[PDB]
């Protein structure tokens, strides 16, 4: 087609651009926050990088306190607005390269963020170029608006709305394709525990496992305080290893037992498809004789959380044909003498699903353990008519150069559409490709992003120059 040979034409250019910034370490870190870096250096210096080669290639940028910002391309009375996220998730080990240098092969790029999302923001970049290096006549403005926080909490989109100007149109190249036109409601709360002898055979001194609400935790460690014999444990666990086809190890160092689990991370819209590190690990604990507390902690785990991905054992199993099931991630797990546990939980529903009623009926039901909630930020499920024209304009750019008749269905992403009233997702993903967002060795293919372009390409010139 007129597209994709004219894509052709600037593959190496995407690739370079791209390549910089997948080299740029957009993990959030708030020990290093500042005005300067609210989320931290990484996320800051990517933001900067599209205002870089934004600047190059002569559009206009405009800031935000250094948490989001936008380019200006159009010309117009209407704008249409294309968020994207420049920040990312953390890397975890097992990486067969450097998950922030990124690796270029014959057909793909190896790197975190190359699918989500560095890889589509700019793919969605170089349409805007392109039409603008083809001089051609804008009847609408573009914002593309990068945020630094919405892998996290929405510190990005949430300040740059408060003040800027809100799209009269916009999608987000951040989840899947053809089009999502929905997606369920996100929520994460905590389930926090409270303290409570006689010298156990074994007493939990630390629990870590997990760090983010979206994300399966890949890694679990224990330290475990043995009372006599414990050449049985040792033996024990790595039976239970074998067993439950997992990788991790032992080492007793300062009189101490320390014990390590290796999982499978995914991202947290869908846990059943990987293996959670540390409610393995938990599971483990169980069959020992253990203090009162981490016998609570570790029941706890095992009563509600272990193998439970749609919260079956919460009493919230929950469906929907139209935007699916109820599914419920532990991301956080953490455990001390002092304070501990605490599970970090991301529960994700369709419309229907009554949050509050069910979150409410467990919350009482838990006050026996000893346990109680604390509720984080709660974004209501996002719906817009498959039909409107607006979808319907993308779809058929997706139609025309994929030929792929599937209609736009609904995911349980949460990405930046629900900030526009009629918000939408708009590609990145063919069925045809592997889905390794937030897993290790994320990559993205040649074919995908240079097809995600020349669609981009021609969805925006429909849109935006063709009246
Ligand atoms: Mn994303
Ligand atoms: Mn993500």
Same mark, same amino acid.
């Given at each position: 087609?007129?597209?994709?040979?004219?894509?052709?034409?600037?593959?190496?250019? =995407?690739?370079?651009?791209?390549?910089?910034?997948?080299?740029?370490?957009?993990?959030?870190?708030?020990?290093?926050?500042?005005?300067?870096?609210?989320?931290?250096?990484?996320?800051?210096?990517?933001?900067?990088?599209?205002?870089?080669?934004?600047?190059?290639?002569?559009?206009?940028?405009?800031?935000?306190?250094?948490?989001?910002?936008?380019?200006?391309?159009?010309?117009?009375?209407?704008?249409?607005?294309?968020?994207?996220?420049?920040?990312?998730?953390?890397?975890?080990?097992?990486?067969?390269?450097?998950?922030?240098?990124?690796?270029?092969?014959?057909?793909? =790029?190896?790197?975190?963020?190359?699918?989500?999302?560095?890889?589509?923001?700019?793919?969605?970049?170089?349409? =805007?170029?392109?039409?603008?290096?083809?001089?051609?006549?804008?009847?609408?403005?573009?914002?593309?608006?990068?945020?630094?926080?919405?892998?996290?909490?929405?510190?990005?989109?949430?300040?740059?709305?408060?003040?800027?100007?809100?799209?009269?149109?916009?999608?987000?190249?951040?989840?899947?394709?053809?089009?999502?036109?929905?997606?369920?409601?996100?929520?994460?709360?905590?389930?926090?525990?409270?303290?409570?002898?006689?010298?156990?055979?074994?007493?939990?001194?630390?629990?870590?496992?997990?760090?983010?609400?979206?994300?399966?935790?890949?890694?679990?460690?224990?330290?475990?305080?043995?009372?006599?014999?414990?050449?049985?444990?040792?033996?024990?666990?790595?039976?239970?290893?074998?067993?439950?086809?997992?990788?991790?190890?032992?080492?007793?160092?300062?009189? =101490?037992?320390?014990?390590?689990?290796?999982?499978?991370?995914?991202?947290?819209?869908?846990?059943?498809?990987?293996?959670?590190?540390?409610?393995?690990?938990?599971?483990?604990?169980?069959?020992?004789?253990?203090?009162?507390?981490?016998?609570?902690?570790?029941?706890?785990?095992?009563?509600?959380?272990?193998?439970?991905?749609?919260?079956?054992?919460?009493?919230?199993?929950?469906?929907?044909?139209?935007?699916?099931?109820?599914?419920?991630?532990?991301?956080?797990?953490?455990?001390?003498?002092?304070?501990?546990?605490?599970?970090?939980?991301?529960?994700?529903?369709?419309?229907?699903?009554?949050?509050?009623?069910?979150?409410?009926?467990?919350?009482?039901?838990?006050?026996?353990?000893?346990?109680?909630?604390?509720?984080?930020?709660?974004?209501?499920?996002?719906?817009?008519?498959?039909?409107?024209?607006?979808?319907?304009?993308?779809?058929?750019?997706?139609?025309?150069?994929?030929?792929?008749?599937?209609?736009?269905?609904?995911?349980?992403?949460?990405?930046?559409?629900?900030?526009?009233?009629?918000?939408?997702?708009?590609?990145?993903?063919?069925?045809?490709?592997?889905?390794?967002?937030?897993?290790?060795?994320?990559?993205?293919?040649?074919?995908?992003?240079?097809?995600?372009?020349?669609?981009?390409?021609?969805?925006?010139?429909?849109?935006?120059?063709?009246?």
């Amino acid at each position: 087609s007129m597209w994709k040979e004219k894509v052709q034409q600037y593959e190496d250019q =995407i690739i370079n651009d791209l390549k910089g910034l997948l080299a740029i370490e957009s993990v959030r870190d708030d020990a290093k926050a500042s005005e300067d870096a609210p989320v931290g250096p990484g996320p800051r210096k990517a933001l900067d990088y599209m205002y870089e080669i934004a600047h190059r290639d002569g559009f206009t940028t405009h800031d935000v306190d250094h948490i989001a910002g936008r380019i200006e391309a159009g010309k117009g009375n209407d704008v249409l607005g294309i968020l994207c996220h420049v920040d990312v998730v953390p890397a975890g080990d097992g990486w067969d390269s450097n998950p922030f240098e990124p690796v270029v092969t014959e057909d793909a =790029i190896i790197a975190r963020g190359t699918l989500d999302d560095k890889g589509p923001t700019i793919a969605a970049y170089y349409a =805007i170029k392109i039409l603008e290096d083809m001089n051609v006549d804008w009847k609408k403005r573009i914002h593309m608006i990068i945020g630094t926080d919405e892998e996290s909490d929405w510190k990005c989109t949430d300040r740059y709305f408060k003040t800027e100007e809100m799209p009269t149109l916009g999608f987000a190249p951040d989840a899947e394709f053809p089009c999502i036109h929905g997606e369920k409601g996100i929520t994460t709360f905590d389930l926090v525990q409270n303290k409570l002898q006689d010298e156990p055979d074994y007493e939990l001194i630390t629990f870590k496992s997990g760090e983010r609400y979206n994300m399966v935790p890949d890694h679990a460690e224990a330290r475990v305080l043995v009372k006599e014999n414990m050449t049985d444990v040792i033996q024990d666990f790595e039976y239970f290893l074998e067993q439950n086809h997992l990788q991790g190890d032992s080492t007793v160092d300062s009189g =101490i037992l320390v014990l390590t689990v290796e999982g499978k991370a995914v991202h947290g819209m869908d846990p059943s498809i990987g293996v959670n590190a540390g409610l393995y690990l938990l599971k483990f604990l169980a069959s020992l004789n253990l203090d009162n507390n981490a016998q609570a902690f570790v029941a706890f785990s095992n009563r509600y959380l272990f193998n439970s991905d749609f919260g079956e054992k919460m009493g919230m199993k929950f469906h929907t044909d139209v935007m699916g099931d109820v599914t419920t991630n532990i991301g956080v797990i953490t455990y001390d003498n002092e304070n501990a546990g605490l599970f970090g939980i991301n529960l994700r529903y369709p419309e229907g699903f009554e949050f509050e009623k069910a979150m409410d009926r467990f919350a009482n039901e838990i006050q026996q353990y000893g346990f109680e909630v604390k509720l984080g930020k709660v974004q209501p499920p996002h719906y817009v008519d498959k039909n409107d024209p607006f979808v319907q304009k993308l779809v058929t750019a997706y139609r025309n150069q994929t030929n792929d008749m599937t209609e736009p269905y609904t995911i349980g992403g949460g990405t930046y559409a629900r900030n526009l009233d009629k918000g939408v997702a708009f590609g990145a993903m063919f069925s045809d490709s592997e889905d390794l967002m937030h897993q290790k060795n994320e990559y993205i293919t040649k074919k995908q992003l240079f097809n995600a372009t020349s669609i981009y390409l021609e969805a925006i010139y429909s849109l935006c120059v063709e009246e």
